[PDB]
Target: Pumilio homolog 1
Amino acid sequence: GRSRLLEDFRNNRYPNLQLREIAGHIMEFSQDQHGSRFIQLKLERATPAERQLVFNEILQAAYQLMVDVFGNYVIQKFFEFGSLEQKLALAERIRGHVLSLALQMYGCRVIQKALEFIPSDQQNEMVRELHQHTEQLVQDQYGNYVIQHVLEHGRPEDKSKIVAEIRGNVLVLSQHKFASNVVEKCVTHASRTERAVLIDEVCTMNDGPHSALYTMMKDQYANYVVQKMIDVAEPGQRKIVMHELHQHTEQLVQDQYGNYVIQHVLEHGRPEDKSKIVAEIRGNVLVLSQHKFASNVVEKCVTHASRTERAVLIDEVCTSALYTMMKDQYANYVVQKMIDVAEPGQRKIVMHKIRPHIATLRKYTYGKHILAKLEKYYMK
Model:
């Protein structure tokens, strides 16, 4: 059913086609996978008159195109390169349907592009329609992305309304697959008072099987919220959060999701918190390096601990444990990190233990990675 023009374009018959040559076929091209991309790349360098001619053929079906798999990109580009009254015309079609679009797969991207390029007075009239269903949007598969956009670029009063909607549900929404992204953006972009209240909510003692903080640290989605809370919490609330983390470090370094929080503390935390984590895995480097989840924790300890702590962690393996670790799929990366970070006096000891197995390492998958990394310092 395609026109001969669109079929020729898809078959690469017109290498230098222009927007003027597809007049009368803009709707057909916008709904085609390759024709839509043609309008996109051309929409950025055409005169406003040429854009207006393209805009004329899609105005009546603009609301249809906003949810189309391929036509929505043409609507997005008109927000990114169209004139003022064109964006006001597109925004007028969205008025009354902001909720319906924000919940759609491609409509949520049209809503984001709209709030990004339309004047502020139209952003306000559009974001006020979002505040009516904030609780519904933060948990939606696509509505949460619109709420995140307001938390990153909206007005502080708009962010306060979103924070107030999250208040009292911080624990539950942190564990939600999509609301966790919204809760994290609140901790990042709310005021220091608002985010201190949100952090304080999960710092309260509850009667649940685990504390609110410990439950979040081991949760699939809420642990990403804990990491952001650790970054921004004031020293008072920070000591409370880190205290709960230290009480469960042994389980967290091996948990499927808790190990990420431990890694975050090792990368960005205070040296005192890093030292207590190093002290916990100290004595178990061999076992934890072969663990599918705890191996990345041990690797971060070798990378971020102090020189004296690294010396003890590295010497613990040298007294063989290195052979078992080089043959392991997870512990292999721990050995390579130890070679890079060890002081030259201790690196000689590590390379002296790897030396008897050099001829056998090439059989293992990562043995090449070990030999190529040994070549950087061995006998140099």
In short: Residues 248-380 form a domain with the Leucine-rich Repeat Variant fold (CATH 1.25.10.10).
